[PDB]
């Protein structure tokens, strides 16, 4: 299921991440609040700033902390997770 | 401390 | 078929002028979304002060953080741009 | 001041 294509995360900090996306993507239809509800809480849990981008047709490019990284699949949605700020 | 750039694609 | 609208934005006038212009060379020279995104995240870093982020993309939602007076999302036709200034 | 959070939706 989740095809973890590029990480920078600690193994635990993916798995959270995986998780999270899990109950946001069972919970909710709308991308933006599948984001918004992984991104919110990783800024609850691992402090802000947190950026989530879900998607099924996007390229990107940014800058992140270091071990604060993450873009992934799961299922036929891309999911980019993220810390800077 | 420290800053690294990545890109992503479908 | 380059044509602009901006749904949302925070940036001034003047610097949301170049995120179009740097958009169109942008989609104009590159195929792939991640060099799109890459080539208009790089121009932005250096004219305007690190650390921006960019997303080029056909399907998504985000949910972002950002500086005041650093944000814009538009179309540029059937693809949106988001570009915005965190860290 | 400073930073505010945002979402989008294709």
Known sequence: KAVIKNADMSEEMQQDSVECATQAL???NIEKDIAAHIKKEFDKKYNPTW??????????????????????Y???????????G | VGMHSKGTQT
């Not at chain 1, 950026?51 to 992934?72: A, D, L, P």
């Not at chain 1, 799961?74 to 800077?84: C, D, E, N, R």
Request: hydrophobic share 40%; glycine share 8%.
């Open chain 1, 26 to 28: 069972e919970k909710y």
């Open chain 1, 51 to 72: 950026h989530c981008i879900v998607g099924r047709n996007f390229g990107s490019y940014v800058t992140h902390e270091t071990k604060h990284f993450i873009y992934f």
């Open chain 1, 74 to 84: 799961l299922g036929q949605v891309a999911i980019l997770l993220f810390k800077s």
